[PDB]
Amino acid sequence: MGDHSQKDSPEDFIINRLSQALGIQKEKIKKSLETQQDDKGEVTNKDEFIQQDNSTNILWVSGQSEKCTFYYGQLIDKFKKKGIAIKLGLHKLTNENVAKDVVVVLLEHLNSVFNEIMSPVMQNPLNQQGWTDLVAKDLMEKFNNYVAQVYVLLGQIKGKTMLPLPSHKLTSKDKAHVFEGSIITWTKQIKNVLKLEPEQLLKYGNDPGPLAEIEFWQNKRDNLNLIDSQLKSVEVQNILHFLKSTYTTPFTKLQAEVKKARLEANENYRYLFTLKDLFSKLQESQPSDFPTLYELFIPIMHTILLIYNKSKTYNQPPRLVVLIREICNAIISNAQAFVDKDTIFSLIDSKETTEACDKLQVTLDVCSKFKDAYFEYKAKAGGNWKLTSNALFVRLDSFLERCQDILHLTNTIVQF
């Protein structure tokens, strides 16, 4: 007998527990939550009819609580049992019933990593009764690529390290060691894919942001170099020997990464000095600043010039100049947005503010001081000026033009 639309709820009360219970039913809380309409017919289609979730969402925003259905969706510490896995009902009370615990919280990814580690434990053990067939090893390969994609998703939220998860674990044919190399290939691609110019394209370009982008890039390659030392196993070397232009292209990209990393590390030492300069600007609470920052800009430039001489082997010395200029660019735009905006609209409205108009001109003067100091550093540099302000500073020039155009019209308003 066991039970039916009740059996599932009976072994669900005991097993769940929460560390210490073993109830074995009777769940008064469960019989009261039964009357959702969809959930009851769902729980009935699981019991004596093979899938039934039982969700427990705690706190958050609009929590499911004692919720779930038969499939449906959990947004939430749940659990799915089997019960007559198409139909083994109205006989032995769901003898193939399979239970599994699924906590709130990724954890959805980590669960997927344990499911693949179970299915590989299954393939190593039996061979199956033809329900798996030769697709057993193919599904194990489909699981491994899923675990790689989860590790790629981990690196997306966290910090790369895809190559380590692409590496096959507990390998004993020759096609499998080739698959390991092919995932190593897309790792080298991710390093070259990342650039200083693509971040500049999609707005941003902050003096703090670009420094952090090199500090994040130099950390990713440093990890990739450490991962390369683990990747380059005595076993992984023998795989490359037994058929090889696939290997040497992955080895060549590694030596290119190791050199670019040495370049990135010098860029990081340069980025660390700019992160202090950006700290001087980022700290600003949009009050005054431009009065002293116009004074503080000339020395901030004088530091950047000395940075060029000190590194010497500074890779991308003409590309890093486009970042530094965009850096000062984004900074000025932020400072400028503060001193006007709704405040400038509000002052114009009242029409009892003349000095505030003059303050706006002072803000523009601070910008002029930055461009003057940029030319004052170009002379101090003495060759290799680069910059290309005539196209780069256009973003800044176009801001100051619009600013000046307001200032021209604001002065006339004071006249009338």
Partner 1 sequence: KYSKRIAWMKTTICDSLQLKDMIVEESFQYEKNKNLLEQFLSGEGLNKIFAYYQVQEQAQNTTGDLEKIQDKAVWFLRITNPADDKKKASQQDGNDNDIIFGEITPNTVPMLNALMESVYSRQIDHIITEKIQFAEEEQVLEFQQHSNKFSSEVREAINLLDYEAISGLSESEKMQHYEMKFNEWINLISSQLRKDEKDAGPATELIYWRSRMQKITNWSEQLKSKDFQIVKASLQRHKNHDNQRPRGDESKLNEAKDNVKYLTTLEKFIPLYNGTPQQIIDTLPALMNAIKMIHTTTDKMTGLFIKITNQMIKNCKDRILNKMIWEQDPAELIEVLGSCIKLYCEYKKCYNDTKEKVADMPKGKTSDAQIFGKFDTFVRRLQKLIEIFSNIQQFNALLEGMDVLTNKFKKIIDDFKKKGHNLLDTANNKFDRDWVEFNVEISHLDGELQN
Contact residues for partner 1 (CB under 8 A)? 2, 11, 14-22, 24, 50-51, 71, 73-75, 77, 80, 82, 85, 96, 98-101, 103, 106, 108, 110-112, 114-115, 117-119, 121-122, 124-126, 128-133, 135-136, 139, 142-143, 145-146, 149-150, 152-153, 156-157
Closer CB to partner 1, residue 193 or residue 379?
193
Closer CB to partner 1, residue 158 or residue 408?
158
Instruction: State the sign of the Cα–Cα–Cα–Cα dihedral 354, 360, 364, 366.
Output: positive
Cβ of residue 77: shortest distance to partner 1, in angstroms? 8
Cβ of residue 252: shortest distance to partner 1, in angstroms? 25
Closer CB to partner 1, residue 157 or residue 391?
157
What are the Cα distances from residue 3, in Å, to 48, 133, 365?
8, 35, 84
Cβ of residue 256: shortest distance to partner 1, in angstroms? 23
CA–centroid distance for 118 within its chain: 29
Cβ of residue 303: shortest distance to partner 1, in angstroms? 32
| Apex 110 CA angle, 219 and 154, nearest 5 | 25
Cβ of residue 153: shortest distance to partner 1, in angstroms? 5
Residue 379 three-state SS: helix
Residue 400 three-state SS: helix
Closer CB to partner 1, residue 92 or residue 244?
92
Closer CB to partner 1, residue 33 or residue 102?
102
Cβ of residue 3: shortest distance to partner 1, in angstroms? 11
Give the total residue count for the chain: 416
Please spell the DSSP secondary structure of 40-75, one letter per residue.
HHHHHHHH----B---B--SSSS---B---SSS---
Residue position matching structure tokens 């800009």: 297
Closer CB to partner 1, residue 19 or residue 32?
19
| Breaks in the chain listed by the residue before each, with C–N > 2.5 Å | 25, 49, 75, 85, 105, 172, 243
Phi first, then psi: give them for residue 56, nearest 5 degrees: -140, 80
